[PDB]
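Bromodomain-containing protein 4
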Amino acid sequence: SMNPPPPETSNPNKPKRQTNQLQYLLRVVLKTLWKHQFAWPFQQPVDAVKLNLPDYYKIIKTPMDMGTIKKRLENNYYWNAQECIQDFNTMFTNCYIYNKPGDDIVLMAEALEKLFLQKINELPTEE
Ligand SMILES: COc1ccc(CCc2nc3cc(-c4c(C)noc4C)ccc3n2CCN2CCOCC2)cc1
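Predicted structure tokens:
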């Protein structure tokens, strides 16, 4: 029940660009969630060994976390804004799959997702 390696965060065989959407995703979306009281469980990959979750990576085959997302944005790993939005959605969905309604972590994820949706509402337009 060991963990997999973390997701890749730096892509040498991909071109890089700054867009207004990617700027918003790091400076507004990621930074607003990262600073939230509830951010710590989501700031690095789930350590299923330390947390005593031996079936986690039997159930979750596309792990994702905000530490990964932050590094991806800082490293220009994403070309399209939708790649980053999908990673946030994957992170929340994984939490909902593994855990149960009423678990503290679920309530925490739901609060962070509401905040995500409030900030994504003001994502700027595509060039
Ligand atoms: C003992 O090993 C660890 C490993 C990581 C961390 C970072 C914080 C933390 N990361 C978490 C991820 C999850 C989680 C997610 C996310 N998805 O499914 C599960 C299940 C749940 C709770 C988490 N928590 C608080 C856990 N509590 C309070 C901290 O000490 C342990 C008990 C802390 C301790």
